[PDB]
Amino acid sequence: SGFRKMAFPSGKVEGCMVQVTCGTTTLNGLWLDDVVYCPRHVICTSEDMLNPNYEDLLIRKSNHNFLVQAGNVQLRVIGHSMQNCVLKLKVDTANPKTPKYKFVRIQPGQTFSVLACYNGSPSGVYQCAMRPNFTIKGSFLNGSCGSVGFNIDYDCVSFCYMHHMELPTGVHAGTDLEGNFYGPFVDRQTAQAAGTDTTITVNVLAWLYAAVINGDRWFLNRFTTTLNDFNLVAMKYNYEPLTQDHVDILGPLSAQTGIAVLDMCASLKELLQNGMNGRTILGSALLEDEFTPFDVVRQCSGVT
Amino acid sequence: SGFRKMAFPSGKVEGCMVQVTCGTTTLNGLWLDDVVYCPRHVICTSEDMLNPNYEDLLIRKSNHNFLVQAGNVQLRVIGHSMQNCVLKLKVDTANPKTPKYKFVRIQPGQTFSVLACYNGSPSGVYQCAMRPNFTIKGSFLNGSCGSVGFNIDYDCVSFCYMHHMELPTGVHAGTDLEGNFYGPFVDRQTAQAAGTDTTITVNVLAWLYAAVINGDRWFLNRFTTTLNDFNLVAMKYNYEPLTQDHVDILGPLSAQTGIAVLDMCASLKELLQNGMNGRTILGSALLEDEFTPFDVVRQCSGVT
Ligand SMILES: O=C(Cc1cccc(Cl)c1)Nn1cn[nH]c1=O
Ligand SMILES: O=C(Cc1cccc(Cl)c1)Nn1cn[nH]c1=O
């Protein structure tokens, strides 16, 4: 027992990290097969970032201007192309450490692990959620660009995020591996509005189920609610409206605990309306929304 | 910017995990060079665990009774010996993936990453602290025994923990890599008292410094305190007494922020006495003690 904010083991991703340098700029790249993927802003200088014309900036670059180093060894760049906000550098060597992988575009509210990197070297790993407003609240300093987010299903790594920037608000924005930003963001040093964020209701309910499984049950009450009534409370408290699709995904947890989803909704309603009264749930004094129902099942069953 | 509970990249440790089976029991082992280390209770059945005579139970076992499997391949066991609560199985093949490593015994209040494993396969990684009472609050199910805790300094892995058991209270106990338990615990299914735990004061102060660096500063006040006055408050609230050695380790953070350690102590005193008044610090509604001053510096400087 016990419930922790667990990241996937990062070994398969560590074997893909490389350093990419273009001119004066260095960031991280992801080497899979014979392609290295990195943020296209590796071609910008500080002056360029205020309003870069990426097409024109890339035309001044040749394959030999992109220095790709896999720790000790240098990769030979034989092609370059820009796809949305990513550059794809074709190298003459397939990464011997390429795991089975997929590129996926995750949905807001889904979770993933991030391997924070600097100069092509992994510094740490943490689990996070894609906010409903398509930002992530990460830990990324200058040079972390190109660090990736991923999930792992047995031996297959699904890459879902590449880090590109920190908004002036301190939250993070990035793309899928085809270079499409999550959210309205553009790769330009301009103030950019992140939409109104909300709490991921289905994840908070999943986490309350994890809490009951792991011994914390003080918040369970004698009440029930309906989706309509619960959603009036979700509205007041900036929680995502709960749908039958969310109730359905909570099915396995409801079955394992014997606590009907609407009954857990009534516990959540009372916690929203009354707070925690100075108590904790799974070591947290707030309602945690970074665990999906799949995360809770995986962690509670010991999947490898 | 941004501050997360970050674990070390686990790749170097994933390459050392193996499955160890003895009779009906399977758990994880750590293969380094030509030795596999695992909890000695791999030799016990359920009946044995109430009061095992490990010496007698080990005498009924031969090298061929220990099945060691490194994912796909079987290791040949050519020796076995018990050292404290660990078994050391000498194998005929050195692990080709053995990283540079050390065995260290960490101090209470220090942090480390855990690679949770089942059947020799890594499931996830999380960061945690060794409590002042020598327990850890982990995420470990049946079969996670043998999963290890570690820190990484560039290319060197310092292994500090091997998981052995879950106390009836749901907290976790284990050993260093020489098989010595942290704390008063014994590897027996008996109710065992974990001492009174305390909050790791130096870590909470380090985390308040991380909060100021990363933009959260509402808790800073116009006050100062002394070590004696602060320790009277630490006493009332079950915090570890602060010493000059702790003040000294906070030196770099005090220098970087310009906030004297005793002034941060006065902010901590007011937070202990008044609570958070429904506010958060680095996304937490409680005072976080799982980041050491070294962790905060490492994370804030981007060390790889
Ligand atoms: O944000 C940037 C550079 C950048 C600035 C503006 C736009 C773009 Cl695409 C990139 N780096 N950065 C700084 N702290 N964290 C982090 O990721
Ligand atoms: O605690 C044990 C077995 C055990 C029981 C009693 C003593 C000893 Cl040494 C081992 N496994 N376990 C169960 N949930 N988490 C976890 O680690």
Swiss-Prot record, chains A, B:
Signal peptide: none annotated. It catalyses: TSAVLQ-|-SGFRK-NH2 and SGVTFQ-|-GKFKK the two peptides corresponding to the two self-cleavage sites of the SARS 3C-like proteinase are the two most reactive peptide substrates. The enzyme exhibits a strong preference for substrates containing Gln at P1 position and Leu at P2 position. Residues 1-304 form the Peptidase C30 domain. Changing residue 145 to A: Complete loss of 3C-like proteinase nsp5 cleavage. Changing residue 132 to H: In strain: Omicron/BA.1, Omicron/BA.2, Omicron/BA.2.12.1, Omicron/BA.2.75, Omicron/BA.4, Omicron/BA.5, Omicron/BQ.1.1, Omicron/XBB.1.5, Omicron/EG.5.1. Changing residue 189 to A: Does not affect ability to cleave and inactivate human TRMT1. Inhibited by pyridone-containing alpha-ketoamides compounds 13a and 13b. In turn, alpha-ketoamide 13b (tert-butyl (1-((S)-1-(((S)-4-(benzylamino)-3,4-dioxo-1-((S)-2-oxopyrrolidin-3-yl)butan-2-yl)amino)-3-cyclopropyl-1-oxopropan-2-yl)-2-oxo-1,2-dihydropyridin-3-yl)carbamate) inhibits SARS-CoV-2 replication in human lung cells. Inhibited ex vivo by michael acceptor inhibitor N3. Inhibited ex vivo by compound 11a and 11b. It is found in: Host cytoplasm; Host Golgi apparatus; Host nucleus. The active site is at 41 (for 3cl-pro activity), 145 (nucleophile). Residues 1-304 are cytoplasmic. There is a cross-link at residues 5, 90 (Glycyl lysine isopeptide (Lys-Gly) (interchain with G-Cter in ubiquitin)). Cleaves the C-terminus of replicase polyprotein at 11 sites. Recognizes substrates containing the core sequence [ILMVF]-Q-|-[SGACN]. Cleaves and inactivates human TRMT1, preventing tRNA guanine(26)-dimethylation of tRNAs. May cleave human NLRP1 in lung epithelial cells, thereby activating the NLRP1 inflammasome pathway. May cleave human GSDMD, triggering alternative GSDME-mediated epithelial cell death upon activation of the NLRP1 inflammasome, which may enhance the release interleukins 1B, 6, 16 and 18. Also able to bind an ADP-ribose-1''-phosphate (ADRP). 3CL-PRO exists as monomer and homodimer. Only the homodimer shows catalytic activity. Interacts with host FBXO22; this interaction promotes the proteasomal degradation of nsp5. This is 3C-like proteinase nsp5. It comes from Severe acute respiratory syndrome coronavirus 2 (2019-nCoV). The chain holds residues 3264 to 3567 of 7096 of the full protein.
